[PDB]
Structure 1
Amino acid sequence: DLTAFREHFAKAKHIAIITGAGVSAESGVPTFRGPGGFWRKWQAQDLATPEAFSRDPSLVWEFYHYRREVMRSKMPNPAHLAIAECEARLGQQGRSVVIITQNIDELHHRAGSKHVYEIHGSLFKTRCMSCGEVKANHKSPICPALDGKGAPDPNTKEARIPVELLPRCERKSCNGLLRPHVVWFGETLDSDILTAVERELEKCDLCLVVGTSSIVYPAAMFAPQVASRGVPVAEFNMECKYHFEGPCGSTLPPALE
């Protein structure tokens, strides 16, 4: 019931919106998981691991370079936009909106959202393997050796880039190998981010779960905490307290206007 949801929306002073893979899938963002979602001969399970990076950093960087570069042609969708406009509009009224996203593509930021927690990191951040520095990086290509590399076609040869020519840390003294600042399979979420998320979720008086569900990770980490405060939760997804079935780019903008 959209009207009942909107009655809560009109009164809520602090909205937390959790976004999952569904909202990035509607922008056409490949993630390489499952049904013939291949990059050359591999899937994300093979590459998005510290062991793959340790064994073949050039191959893993080709894969991340490809992913960075495809984002030039993948755009924010109406769900991203509605969420950013809603944040701006409510902020002007002294009402707060925060986004907790599992997505690493920065589409929320390209849509105009400010208060965003990236629990899995970003394709457009690097972390230095040596000094640990995390930095924004949108450079195309990230390093000259990767220029024109990363093609997904199974026939493509490996670039076999020497490790010293992959992205390096720019502090002259350091020059460590950079890795994508993304949470890989088998790795832990950042505790500081989770603390901040918990504070937002404790404060919130309405919670939306978009392009994933309350019962799965990562929403399942916190959604019980919010439900037990008596706080309404509204789901927007394509799956079987409120639930709006369909593509988020159709359902969300009318709910948030």
Structure 2
Amino acid sequence: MDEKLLKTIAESKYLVALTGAGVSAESGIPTFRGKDGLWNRYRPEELANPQAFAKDPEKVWKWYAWRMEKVFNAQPNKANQAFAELERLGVLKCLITQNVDDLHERAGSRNVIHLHGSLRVVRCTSCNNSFEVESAPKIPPLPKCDKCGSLLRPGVVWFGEMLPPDVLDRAMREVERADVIIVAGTSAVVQPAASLPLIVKQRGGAIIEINPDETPLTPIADYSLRGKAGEVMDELVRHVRKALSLKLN
């Protein structure tokens, strides 16, 4: 929270952000890793991969329907509001997220890229039918496609699956032109998402990491703020808004 940091953000020409589960934590949604992380209680090998889904689609669907209900009923937090505001001010150009929740959207964020899909989306395992839901389905019975009758599945990316090419490519273009990237609430271990901030640095840009813990990205982060996204982003955006308002124009 020094002058240089504020300056780096306020004067940026193309600032982007990469967010992870930590940015939704203050909305009552647990993260995947860490203390009370979902992967520390539930096994990703049974709930986050095509093999597990094929083996027991009812169990996987029951788990996702539960997660969907949790997310749809949660409200965006201060971190979410701050990111939307930073975009409103014209500073944040694009928000790249690994989150499958829609808290960024409900806070007002517009240019959001969902690298790993979205819990709002349901798609067919056979044909190209896909659509969004307003609330979570009840399981059983297994959600079936109204077009061909095959099993439907959550529109999220599982381990071993390829992120949609057009989606990752868009994110790639964003980080290739960003001079500053805010990396908040992510453990920086899951690929290829974890590689995006490196692009910014390699091309000459700056990395501003926001996370209560240190991660594999910390060593190359120009700035690494040890705190919660809500508190840090709220203060950061407020100072940036103040700085911009002070400009003689």
TM range (shorter): 0.7 to 0.9
Percent identity, aligned pairs only, is: 42
Query: Does the Cα contact within 8 Å between 2:208 and 2:223 map onto a contact in 1?
Result: yes
Q: Paired residue for 1:210? A: 184
Q: How far apart are residue 217 of structure 1 and its match?
A: 4.0
Distance 1:32 1:213 in 2: 9
Q: Quick one: which of 173, 181, 188 aligns to 2:155?
A: 181
Q: CA deviation at 1:30?
A: 3.2
Q: Which protein has greater RCO, CA pairs closer than 8 Å, 6+ apart?
A: 1
* Correspondence for 2:29: 29
Q: How many residues align?
A: 230
Q: Secondary structure at the match of 1:227?
A: helix
The alignment partner of 1:105 has SS state of coil
- The aligned runs of 1:141-152 (5 Å cut-off) are 141-142=136-137, 146=138
Which residue of the partner structure matches residue 251 of structure 1? Answer: 232
For 2:202, which of 208, 215, 228 is the aligned residue?
A: 228
Shift of 1:215: 7.0
Normalising by structure 2, we get a TM-score of: 0.83
Q: Secondary structure at the match of 1:188?
A: coil
Deviation per residue, 1:73-120 (Å, 9 max, x gap): 322111111001111221xxxx55211111111111111111111111
Match of 1:193 in 2: 167
- Consecutive unaligned residues of structure 2, counting only runs of 5 or more, are 215-221, 239-249
What is the rounded CA distance, in whole Å, between the counterparts of 2:86 and 2:154 in structure 1? Answer: 30
Per-residue CA shift, 1:165-195, capped at 9, x if unaligned? 4222233xx2332100111122221111111
Q: How does 1:79-94 map to 2 (within 5 A)?
A: 79-90=79-90
Instruction: Return 5+ residue gaps in structure 1 as ranges.
Output: 150-160
Code of the aligned partner of 1:9 = I
Equivalent position SS for 2:28 = coil
CA-CA distance at 1:249 after TM superposition: 0.5
CA displacement, residues 96-149 of structure 1 (integer Å, 9 cap, x when unaligned): 5211111111111111111111111111101211113332222x342xxx1xx5
Note closer, same or farther for the CA distance 1:105–1:87 as it changes in structure 2 (3 Å cut).
same
> 1:131 pairs with 119, 127, 130, which one?
127
CA 1:214–1:227 in structure 2 vs 1: closer, same or farther (change >3 Å)?
Answer: farther
- Counterpart of 2:20 in structure 1: which amino acid? G
Change (3 A) 1:186 1:215: closer
2:104 is aligned, of 102, 108, 113, to 108
8 Å CA contact 1:31, 1:44 repeated in 2: no
The 3 A distance-change label for structure 1 pair 170 and 88 is: farther
Across the aligned residues of Structure 1 and Structure 2, the Cα RMSD in angstroms comes to 2.4
Distance 2:22 2:97 in 1: 11
Report the counterpart of residue 154 of structure 1 in structure 2: none
Report the counterpart of residue 143 of structure 2 in structure 1: 167
